[PDB]
Design a protein around this ligand. Sequence first.
Ligand SMILES: CCCCCCCC(=O)N[C@H]1CCOC1=O
Ligand SMILES: CCCCCCCC(=O)N[C@H]1CCOC1=O
Lengths: 178, 178
Amino acid sequence: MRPLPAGLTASQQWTLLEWIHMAGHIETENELKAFLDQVLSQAPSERLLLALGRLNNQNQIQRLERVLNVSYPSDWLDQYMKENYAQHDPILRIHLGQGPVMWEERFNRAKGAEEKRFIAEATQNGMGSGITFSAASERNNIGSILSIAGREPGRNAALVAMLNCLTPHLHQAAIRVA
Amino acid sequence: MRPLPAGLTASQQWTLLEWIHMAGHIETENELKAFLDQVLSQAPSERLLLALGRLNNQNQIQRLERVLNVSYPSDWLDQYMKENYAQHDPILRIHLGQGPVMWEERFNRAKGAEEKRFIAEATQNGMGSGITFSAASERNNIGSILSIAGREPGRNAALVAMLNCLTPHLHQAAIRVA
Ligand SMILES: CCCCCCCC(=O)N[C@H]1CCOC1=O
Ligand SMILES: CCCCCCCC(=O)N[C@H]1CCOC1=O
């Protein structure tokens, strides 16, 4: 269990309390979508996506089970699927539950030609910067990623900590919904 | 979704935040038991029990699926089962998810001879006063009750509100564990 954040204002603590309280009541994809819209309206980004996947023995996604696009541009998602970017996207190689991953840091490390190509294309599409939070369950070999695109989220330490703490509850909700 | 309490101190808000955060990480009966011990240590009672049941069309328990005794006296539980009190205990007739139920208020209304007998015996066993919180899921026709025996819990408005808000998350955890 990841520890709750220190240093939140009373308003931020209350927001996080409401978020986790609400998350625990989510039963349907309708509700899950509506909740993520609510969370979205609180972050310095307009681009959010949640995905559920089956994991390998190193807690990496080996099969995407469910993708809930909240506000990624549909044309980017179409391209991602059409050009099979799942195979080259460094973000899909994260070891889930190992902490928040800043995209720029991860992208700057990419070695392969195909990965560099993807990064170039993501960058052109406004997806060059962002953060991915994650949670994983041993119970059933399943994990979730919550991705938010943009530079500003990562620069708000409080928001990062809040979203990170919310992520395992979004994971439980996503399992219920699936 | 039941609303979060108003009027909690910052310490109480933090306790509730920790409780719901922890509850969302519970996967095993071991963990569920340990968590309830933790919650117990914060309330003016020493007697707590959680139960999961299948519900009728009025959200009442029709079949007990799982009983997690945290600190009810084992001799009382033995008697309850041996004398088939489940059939006469006014608390098992609550409409789950309809708000916290104070036992003394409910007991004072009992009409039947068998119910009065039960109440008399419960009272002799230190179980005459208490509160039961509840949650119900339409998804799978299942509900949970969280019972705490004693007079003092009910007299702490903050604790009541906190435990009430925790209850739906304990319900989700209990379903996962079952
Ligand atoms: C169709 C499923 C797409 C899932 C993408 C999940 C990981 C992620 O958010 N990748 C970022 C990394 C840069 O561009 C992206 O789309
Ligand atoms: C063996 C299962 C017993 C479940 C009892 C759940 C309801 C409850 O807490 N009843 C209180 C009411 C007074 O005495 C009791 O035991």
